[PDB]
Amino acid sequence: EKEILWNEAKAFIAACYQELGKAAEVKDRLADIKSEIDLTGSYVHTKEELEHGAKMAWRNSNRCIGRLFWNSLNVIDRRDVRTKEEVRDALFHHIETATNNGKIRPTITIFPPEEKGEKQVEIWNHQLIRYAGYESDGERIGDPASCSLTAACEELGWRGERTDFDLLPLIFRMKGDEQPVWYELPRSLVIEVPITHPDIEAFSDLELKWYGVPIISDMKLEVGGIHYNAAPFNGWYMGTEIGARNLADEKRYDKLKKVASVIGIAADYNTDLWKDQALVELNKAVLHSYKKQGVSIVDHHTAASQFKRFEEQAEEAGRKLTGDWTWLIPPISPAATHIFHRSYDNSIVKPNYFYQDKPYE
Amino acid sequence: EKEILWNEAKAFIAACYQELGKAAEVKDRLADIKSEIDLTGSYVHTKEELEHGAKMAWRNSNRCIGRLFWNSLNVIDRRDVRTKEEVRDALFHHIETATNNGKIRPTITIFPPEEKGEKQVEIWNHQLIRYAGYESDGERIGDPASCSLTAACEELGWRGERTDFDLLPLIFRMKGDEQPVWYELPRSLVIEVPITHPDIEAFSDLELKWYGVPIISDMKLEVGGIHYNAAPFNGWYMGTEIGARNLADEKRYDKLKKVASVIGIAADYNTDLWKDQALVELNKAVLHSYKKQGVSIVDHHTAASQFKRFEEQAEEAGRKLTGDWTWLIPPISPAATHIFHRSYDNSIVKPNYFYQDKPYE
Numbered sequence: 001e002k003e004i005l006w007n008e009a010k011a012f013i014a015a016c017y018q019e020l021g022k023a024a025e026v027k028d029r030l031a032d033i034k035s036e037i038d039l040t041g042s043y044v045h046t047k048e049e050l051e052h053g054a055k056m057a058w059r060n061s062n063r064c065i066g067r068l069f070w071n072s073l074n075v076i077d078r079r080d081v082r083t084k085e086e087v088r089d090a091l092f093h094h095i096e097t098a099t100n101n102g103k104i105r106p107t108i109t110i111f112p113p114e115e116k117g118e119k120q121v122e123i124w125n126h127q128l129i130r131y132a133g134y135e136s137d138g139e140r141i142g143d144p145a146s147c148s149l150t151a152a153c154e155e156l157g158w159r160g161e162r163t164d165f166d167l168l169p170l171i172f173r174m175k176g177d178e179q180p181v182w183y184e185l186p187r188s189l190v191i192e193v194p195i196t197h198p199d200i201e202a203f204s205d206l207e208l209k210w211y212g213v214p215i216i217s218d219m220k221l222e223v224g225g226i227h228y229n230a231a232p233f234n235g236w237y238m239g240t241e242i243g244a245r246n247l248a249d250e251k252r253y254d255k256l257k258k259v260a261s262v263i264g265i266a267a268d269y270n271t272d273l274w275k276d277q278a279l280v281e282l283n284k285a286v287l288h289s290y291k292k293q294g295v296s297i298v299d300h301h302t303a304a305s306q307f308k309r310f311e312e313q314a315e316e317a318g319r320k321l322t323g324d325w326t327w328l329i330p331p332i333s334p335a336a337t338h339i340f341h342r343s344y345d346n347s348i349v350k351p352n353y354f355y356q357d358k359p360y361e
Numbered sequence: 362e363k364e365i366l367w368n369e370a371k372a373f374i375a376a377c378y379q380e381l382g383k384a385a386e387v388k389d390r391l392a393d394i395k396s397e398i399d400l401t402g403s404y405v406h407t408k409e410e411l412e413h414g415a416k417m418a419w420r421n422s423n424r425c426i427g428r429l430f431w432n433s434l435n436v437i438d439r440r441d442v443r444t445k446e447e448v449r450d451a452l453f454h455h456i457e458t459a460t461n462n463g464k465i466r467p468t469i470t471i472f473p474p475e476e477k478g479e480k481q482v483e484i485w486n487h488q489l490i491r492y493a494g495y496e497s498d499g500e501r502i503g504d505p506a507s508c509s510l511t512a513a514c515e516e517l518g519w520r521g522e523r524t525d526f527d528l529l530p531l532i533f534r535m536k537g538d539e540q541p542v543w544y545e546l547p548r549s550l551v552i553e554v555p556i557t558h559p560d561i562e563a564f565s566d567l568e569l570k571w572y573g574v575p576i577i578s579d580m581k582l583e584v585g586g587i588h589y590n591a592a593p594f595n596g597w598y599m600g601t602e603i604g605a606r607n608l609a610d611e612k613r614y615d616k617l618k619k620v621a622s623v624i625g626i627a628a629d630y631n632t633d634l635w636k637d638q639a640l641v642e643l644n645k646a647v648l649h650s651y652k653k654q655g656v657s658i659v660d661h662h663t664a665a666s667q668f669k670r671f672e673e674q675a676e677e678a679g680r681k682l683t684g685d686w687t688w689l690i691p692p693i694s695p696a697a698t699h700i701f702h703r704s705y706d707n708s709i710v711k712p713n714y715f716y717q718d719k720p721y722e
């Protein structure tokens with residue numbers, strides 16, 4: 001067990017210190033770690049290792065198109081938290097600093113790691129900011145992707161107003177406790193963007209909106225054998241995530257038919273390509289709405305260009321590039337991006353972010 | 362060598378006869394084949410085996426979304442040809458019968474197979490009907506994908522008029538001959554569709570058009586160890602092939618900027634999603650134009666629905682399904698199809714159609 005930890009530690013420190021220009025400080029740091037592992041059963045990252053490890057992990061995320069700015073990640077070290085009030089305020093602070101009045105800072109807050117595979121902090125939220133979902137005999141409300149977590153929260157004394165956009169509470173469980181606590185979100189901390197169209201005034205009749213900052217809070221950060229199961233991170237949205245998936249998928253908000261209505265086209269014939277046309281106008285609306293409000297967002301064409309630069313930067317730096325083609329291509333006009341026309345190695349490189357099992361369900 | 366042939370033969374005949382309800386006739390047919398191989402070094406398919414083998418090959422084509430109608434394939438047995446006039450007239454006939462006045466019949470014409478890996482007939486065309494491409498100091502004309510074949514044809518005494526839509530000649534080489542012959546296509550045999558838009562009259566200013574029937578003529582059909590290197594096949598187009606790739610790719614006709622102009626939108630900002638909007642209108646134009654002229658075509662939504670039925674038909678029949686996710690998803694709105702949201706096994710099953718090296722280049 002402390003063998004696999006030692007092995008990953010050797011690989012990580014060598015690479016991390018190499019990139020940081022600290023290649024000479026390796027042996028003595030690896031020395032201390034080997035002792036610390038022998039005596040304690042684990043080791044503790046320096047602030048520098050942790051910060052860079054979180055950046056390397058983003059860089060190795062095969063499914064991420066926004067990796068160009070991996071080195072500008074804002075890393076918050078909250079390994080000091082011991083109380084649920086401390087966790088809550090850390091999460092509250094993350095939302096505030098990442099939002100930054102709309103000029104979103106890509107940020108990660110890092111909580112204490114697993115000890116013996118035992119979690120210190122266990123976050124139930126998929127994202128820190130997400131809408132509830134309800135299904136009750138034919139009546140479908142909100143975000144269906146949140147149906148299971150919502151039912152779980154309502155098992156704990158929470159109650160949603162049952163709008164299509166109920167903000168889910170923060171819900172996490174501390175080590176020792178049998179149940180998670182939940183805290184309602186302060187509305188003043190959550191930026192939302194109402195969806196309007198630049199040309200079509202009737203688009204507002206849909207009363208669509210989305211939240212400003214996507215903060216993934218259910219993935220495990222792995223850095224040199226250390227498992228930070230609780231390390232919520234954020235960037236800004238690519239418009240397609242909202243307009244082509246969240247609001248378009250039949251198993252999500254399923255709004256394409258209503259979009260077709262308000263833009264004045266029939267939704268009767270496949271050969272009219274009404275879904276395609278609705279997707280374009282909806283995605284135009286999303287980008288326009290975020291930019292009009294001053295909330296950071298990127299379109300899929302610009303993002304692909306940035307990713308091309310990331311590919312170029314990688315080869316120039318002598319690093320192997322890895323990627324998941326199936327996730328890197330945007331869900332609209334993917335053949336209009338260079339991504340579609342080349343292949344990527346889907347090998348896993350650590351440090352990285354990983355899926356982990358949900359405590360609920 | 363006759364070991365691998367015998368092995369593939371055993372696997373094929375057993376499966377083919379099983380599907381045909383002729384499972385009892387297997388041993389005696391396998392008997393004759395084993396003798397025929399021993400004495401001759403190869404074996405000859407019955408008409409029934411060949412017809413069904415060609416259908417099974419289509420069914421096993423992982424990259425094909427149109428596989429629902431695999432069993433309705435029109436198979437033409439031209440293993441009898443010996444002369445280049447016979448080949449030419451066979452190819453001429455294929456075009457005519459497949460076109461069928463616009464009501465396209467999915468058809469394959471099968472020529473004599475390789476003997477000792479030696480080709481009887483060697484087709485140079487990618488498709489029987491395709492446009493030439495020219496590149497001469499900054500001057501780019503026609504289809505760039507045809508640049509190498511065009512130069513090759515012009516090395517043989519052919520000369521194109523250098524329009525953007527020069528019909529390439531049929532070009533193939535007979536066994537024994539050192540050079541291929543080429544035959545100009547009779548215009549009366551080639552249906553073309555001028556591209557118009559249902560709502561936007563200015564779209565005709567682009568003077569776009571495409572050919573009616575895509576007839577792939579450079580792939581090898583493999584059936585039970587027998588290599589039919591020359592077996593051109595056709596179906597009808599999925600609109601996206603023309604509107605989202607052939608006319609949209611920068612390395613093809615690259616028409617999106619001009620489409621944006623004629624539909625009256627700016628092509629200046631990525632966030633306007635002008636490429637996405639142009640793709641939709643161009644693809645609407647393509648579908649409308651084919652249907653208006655009475656030439657068979659399918660949109661990507663309908664095609665995906667048909668493919669879903671193919672998936673259902675396959676499981677119901679107890680057959681494993683194989684597919685290439687990266688090719689099955691349409692290049693526009695793929696997330697609007699069920700294909701995007703499931704995975705496919707990309708295993709190779711024979712019989713099948715395979716790539717083979719180009720004689721030119």
Ligand code: HEM
Pocket residue numbers: 054057058061063064065066067069073106107108233234235236237238241298303327353
């Ligand atoms: C800066 C702006 C960013 C943009 C525009 C961006 C874009 C994207 C997009 C569009 C996806 C696909 C998500 C989906 O389809 O559900 C993605 C996946 C991902 N991104 Fe990023 N990203 C950004 C920043 C970050 C940051 C800061 C991290 C973490 C340090 C990160 C790590 C990931 C990971 C781990 C995934 C895959 C999640 C999964 O497998 O489900 N990205 N990114």
Ligand code: HEM
Pocket residue numbers: 415418419422424425426427428430434467468469594595596597598599602659664688714
């Ligand atoms: C009936 C109408 C048909 C439709 C709508 C259809 C649709 C498609 C499409 C859209 C592709 C992708 C082509 C590309 O992206 O370049 C494809 C690939 C393919 N189709 Fe079909 N197809 C049809 C009939 C057939 C037939 C009759 C055959 C042969 C018996 C066939 C075998 C294949 C093969 C082998 C490929 C892959 C070619 C490659 O790997 O480059 N299909 N099909």
Ligand SMILES: N/C(=N/c1cccc(CO[C@@H]2CCNC2)c1)c1cccs1
Pocket residue numbers: 214215216233234235236237238241
């Ligand atoms: N733009 C983003 N979009 C996403 C990035 C990663 C994941 C997700 C949502 O998670 C997937 C949705 C369904 N399965 C996992 C969204 C980011 C969130 C945090 C940093 S970038």
Ligand SMILES: N/C(=N/c1cccc(CO[C@@H]2CCNC2)c1)c1cccs1
Pocket residue numbers: 575576577594595596597598599602
């Ligand atoms: N619809 C079609 N489209 C295609 C199907 C298969 C292949 C192609 C074109 O070949 C690819 C284009 C570039 N590489 C190979 C087009 C068909 C042609 C013949 C039967 S169906």
Ligand SMILES: C[C@H](O)[C@H](O)[C@H]1CNc2nc(N)[nH]c(=O)c2N1
Pocket residue numbers: 340341342343687688689
């Ligand atoms: C690299 C990638 O495999 C390549 O660009 C593929 C992607 N999927 C495709 N799918 C289809 N139908 N046709 C294509 O030409 C391609 N190109």
Ligand SMILES: C[C@H](O)[C@H](O)[C@H]1CNc2nc(N)[nH]c(=O)c2N1
Pocket residue numbers: 326327328701702703704
């Ligand atoms: C089956 C397939 O892998 C799945 O639907 C994937 C495809 N590519 C994707 N790409 C992104 N960015 N996001 C997704 O949710 C998916 N879904």
Ligand SMILES: [Cl-]
Pocket residue numbers: 214241246
């Ligand atoms: Cl999201």
Ligand SMILES: [Cl-]
Pocket residue numbers: 575602607
């Ligand atoms: Cl084509």
